[PDB]
Design a protein around this ligand. Sequence first.
Ligand SMILES: Nc1ncnc2c1ncn2[C@H]1C[C@H](O)[C@@H](COP(=O)(O)OP(=O)(O)OP(=O)(O)O)O1
Ligand SMILES: [Ca+2]
Ligand SMILES: [Mn+2]
Length: 430
Amino acid sequence: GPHMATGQDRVVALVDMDCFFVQVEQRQNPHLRNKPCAVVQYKSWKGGGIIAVSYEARAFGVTRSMWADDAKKLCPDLLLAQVRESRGKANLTKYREASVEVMEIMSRFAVIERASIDEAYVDLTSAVQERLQKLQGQPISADLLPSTYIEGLPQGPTVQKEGMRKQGLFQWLDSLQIDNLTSPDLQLTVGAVIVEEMRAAIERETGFQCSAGISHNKVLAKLACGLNKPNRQTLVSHGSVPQLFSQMPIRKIRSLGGKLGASVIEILGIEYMGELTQFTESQLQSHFGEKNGSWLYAMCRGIEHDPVKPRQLPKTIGCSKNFPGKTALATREQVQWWLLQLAQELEERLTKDRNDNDRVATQLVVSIRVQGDKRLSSLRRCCALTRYDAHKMSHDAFTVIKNCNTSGIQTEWSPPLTMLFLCATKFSAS
DNA sequence: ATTATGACGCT
DNA sequence: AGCGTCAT
Ligand SMILES: Nc1ncnc2c1ncn2[C@H]1C[C@H](O)[C@@H](COP(=O)(O)OP(=O)(O)OP(=O)(O)O)O1
Ligand SMILES: [Ca+2]
Ligand SMILES: [Mn+2]
């Protein structure tokens, strides 16, 4: 009852860029705007691999992970932009720099947590309190929420989408009690007003469109963001959760899309997030562990406590390359050349990071894959990173892996290497 | 031959 | 620490 926490203490948003790498390329090349188009890396094998897809191209069935040659079968007029290649490898600098553009704008409104190259969480609780005082019990006009969906509305007593959006928004606003400055529903609504402003700023100042979710925690904000993309934002209220979750496949919730989620389904014999409410906390802890069990117990009621962490910058800087099939590295000269290529990109990025962000990395992680292993990584070893020098880092990396070589001959490398990875970690202020 | 990342959990 | 899981 009255002591039952409802997880309505915070206002959290998740802002996620629409088809991000495609928009970056469309800004640069106007010929790609408002077209079926995709971003591809490499070229020789099956036309390259698609990693981002415009919404026009999605209508033809083009998806991420698809080979471009196959995408062209679905969409003959598909336009393609290629990821830059430097030092023999794909280089994602353009997209990292475009990410910084957006993150810095978001940071003007609130402290953000960078969750990926194209999305960040926002804790808007304090900003909402501030705006609520400015409003002075003034109702929120629908005009302040021009791209907002209210999940679950309209209900009860019609065929256009924009019309449906406004119907839902009007039902929501009509029910709002703006007299209570601690009403969670009102707080979410003001949160949505701020996120409209945030999204307008991003589009004005970068040219990039995005979607957003507004709710009381990160998992619901993330889920919300996806409901109406692209170029729209969605408010998921605490009250909307029972209906929303009653038909929501468990795999849709962030962190449940893999083995744990499959285990929840298998062990409990359920399909939807809402079905979790019928288990005790102890029951869930018994199957999935203390931490997961408590997290699931709360999550299926719309409650989550994970904080928005004040972190705008990545914690690591890494540079990775696969060497598939026949291209696997089978000579020491090969291995050394590619370690140097990776190290040179790493040095470049590290030097820029040090200048921009007043920090220095102190640990170098080296990872490889050997031909045969189905795991992402076969071996991961750390050594000290004491100088931002590519030849030193590549020599050090070679030192830490050189005994993985099964070959009795040391000119040759066996089993051939199908992946190399260098990562700088453990930053200190400088 | 679904690549290049990047965070956090376990023991 | 080195590995695994999940994610974008
Ligand atoms: N598996 C991947 N491999 C390489 N790059 C990826 C992968 N997934 C995502 N990216 C990159 C390209 C994306 O444009 C960018 C953001 O990813 P994501 O938010 O999942 O999709 P998206 O922004 O392209 O479309 P959406 O509008 O559906 O969000 O990160
Ligand atoms: Ca996105
Ligand atoms: Mn994203």
